[PDB]
Structure formats: C-alpha cells, structure tokens
Amino acid sequence: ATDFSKLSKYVETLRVKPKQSIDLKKDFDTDYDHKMLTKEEGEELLNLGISKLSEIQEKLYASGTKSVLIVFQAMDAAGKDGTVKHIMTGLNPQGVKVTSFKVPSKIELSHDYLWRHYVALPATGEIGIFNRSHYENVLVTRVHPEYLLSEQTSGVTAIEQVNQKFWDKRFQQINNFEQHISENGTIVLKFFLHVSKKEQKKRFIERIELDTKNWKFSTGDLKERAHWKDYRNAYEDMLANTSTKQAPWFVIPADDKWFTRLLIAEIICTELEKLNLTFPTVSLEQKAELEKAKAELVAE
Ligand SMILES: O=P(O)(O)C(Nc1cc(Cl)cc(Cl)c1)P(=O)(O)O
C-alpha cells in the first residue's frame, strides 16, 4: 500500500532474469507512466537513498571485507555521467573510485581486453564504479568490428571472421570473470540506463541549442545514433547472456532523470543491505580506554 513498497515491487521487475530473452522495444520501458510518487517526493527519497548509501560505504570501509563493483552502460545522453556524478557527490572520496574506460592505450591494447578492467577492480572495503566497463568489448566493438583489428590479442585480422560464436565466447569469458570475483568477495551490480531514441534526440537538440554547453557536441555523436539498431541488438544479446543471479543486470528507464537516479539508488541500497553491515562496536576494554582518555584530558 505504502509508496515505498510500490517502488520496491516495481524495482524487482527491472532485474534481468537469467533465463529470459530480451526485446528492448517491448519488454522494457524507457519511461514509466505509472509512477508511485511525485518528482518532489522522488527527489527527497533520492537524498535519503544517497545518505543511506554513504552510511553503507563507511561501514564497508571500516570492515575491509567485501568490495563492490557497480557497472554503468547506456546510449549517449541517457544520463549516465550525471547519475554517476550525483551518487559520487554524496559518498566519501576515501573509499570510492570511479574509472571511465576510454579508448584503450597502446599498452592496454597489448593485453587481453579484460586486463585493464581487472587491474582497476575495487579492493576490500571499497566501492568501484565502472562508468563504461568491460562490456564495451561486446557493444561498441560489436557495432564497429573494425576496432578488433587494432586489438593485437583478439586474433581478428579481418572483420568477416567475426560471427555469433566470437560474441558467445566473450560472454562466457565475461561471465567467468564476474563469477570469479563474486566468489572472492566482490558484489557486482550492473545498470543499463535505457533511454528512448526520441528522448535522446530531444536531449541532443537541447544541448546543441545551449550556447553554454554546445562546445561539447561533436559530429561523432550523431554517428553512434545512426547505429541505434545495431547497438540495440548488441545490448539485447548481451543482457540475455550475462545477467546471472550472482551478477545481475538491471534495465533502468532513463527518460525521466530524477526517476532513473531514484531507482538506481534504491537498488544499490537494497542490494547492499543484504550484507548486514554494522559499525564497529566498543568493547569493554575499549570503553575503559575512552574513559581513561577523557579523564586525562579533563585532568590537564
Ligand atoms: O552521460 P550523459 O548521458 O549524462 C552525457 N550527456 C549528453 C547529453 C547530450 Cl545532449 C549529448 C550527449 Cl552525446 C551526451 P554528459 O555530457 O553528461 O557526459
């Protein structure tokens, strides 16, 4: 009945189940038109979600036991960078690291495609946010197989060699990677921000018309949009083969940003709450030390 219980219920429908097939036009909304709360209420609940998340982070850091890896993927202008900024703003910098994986360096191209991601994994007690991730290697690379030609370790000397079997094998490799880290103390949560083609267009135009922001918009941004369908295919096949119970994907409607952020904060808090984190407790010995310390201070 409660608005929070409505949200909690709705959130469980966003998890990609391991056995399901994925049609992003039909099975998953870019916009939710049955919202259980107003924007204003959503904004106030998001702030609580960020505070709860900061509390969890501090308990995680003080514990130094599990690590947390949060992956974000999205089409351009879905609101991924803003979502990451908004979260980061409310967390302590000491225990939290954002890595944005760009075009690989020459050195990175001299290792397997997973190496730079493995290198950047979170240490125990830390939270690692991959803003773009290892998944780029079954997404941007799949839409533009020509990139595989610069990958010395990938074994591809001509794009005609690349077929469904090449992608199936990357999905297995990615799954093995995430299972391993999951079996060795890392909680893995993956978010695809799902924005409609129409809303992407409206965001592109809005930016182009802002004399304050339009220095940021290139011709290349259109080019990736012209591959909308190829990206959708790549995303579908990936979500259908790399969401496990242990490392789930969540598809988040991205067309209303406040709602996107709310949902992501909720899911992260919900999932991390299963860890039952608590702050350190003060033992009798420690209590005696405190009382002694305070006595000495007062005695000065
Ligand atoms: O990652 P975000 O989606 O937040 C991205 N926003 C954005 C906006 C426009 Cl109108 C065009 C393009 Cl190509 C991107 P950013 O500029 O915040 O990184």
Atom of ligand 1 lying closest to residue 208 CA: 10
Residue nearest to atom 15 of ligand 1 (CA): 81
Residue 112 Cβ contacting ligand 1 at under 6 Å: no
Give the pairing of strands 186-194 and 96-100. Answer: unpaired
CA of 226 to the centre of ligand 1 (A): 16
CA of 181 to the centre of ligand 1 (A): 31
Residue 7 Cβ contacting ligand 1 at under 6 Å: no
Residue nearest to atom 8 of ligand 1 (CA): 77
For residues 228 and 230, what is the distance between their CA atoms, to the nearest angstrom?
Answer: 6
Is the four-CA dihedral 35, 37, 43, 48 of positive or negative sign? negative
End-to-end CA distance of the chain: 58
For residues 191 and 267, what is the distance between their CA atoms, to the nearest angstrom?
Answer: 10
Solved by what technique?
A: X-ray
Q: DSSP for the chain?
A: --HHHHHHHHHHTTB--TT----TTTSS-SS-SS-SS-HHHHHHHHHHHHHHHHHHHHHHHHH-S-EEEEEEEE-TTSSHHHHHHHHHHTS-STTEEEEE--SPPHHHHTS-TTHHHHHTPPPTT-EEEEES-GGGGGTHHHH-GGGGGT-TTS--SSGGG--HHHHHHHHHHHHHHHHHHHHTTEEEEEEEEE--HHHHHHHHHHHHT-TTTGGG--HHHHHHHTTHHHHHHHHHHHHHHH--SSS-EEEEE-SSHHHHHHHHHHHHHHHHHTT---PPP--HHHHHHHHHHHHHHHH-
Residue nearest to atom 12 of ligand 1 (CA): 77
Nearest to 203 by CA among 251, 140, 250, 254: 254
Atom of ligand 1 lying closest to residue 83 CA: 4
CATH number of 1-300: 3.40.50.300
Residue 95 Cβ contacting ligand 1 at under 6 Å: no
For residues 248 and 174, what is the distance between their CA atoms, to the nearest angstrom?
Answer: 13
Calculate the CA 232 to chain-centre distance.
18
Residue 86 Cβ contacting ligand 1 at under 6 Å: no
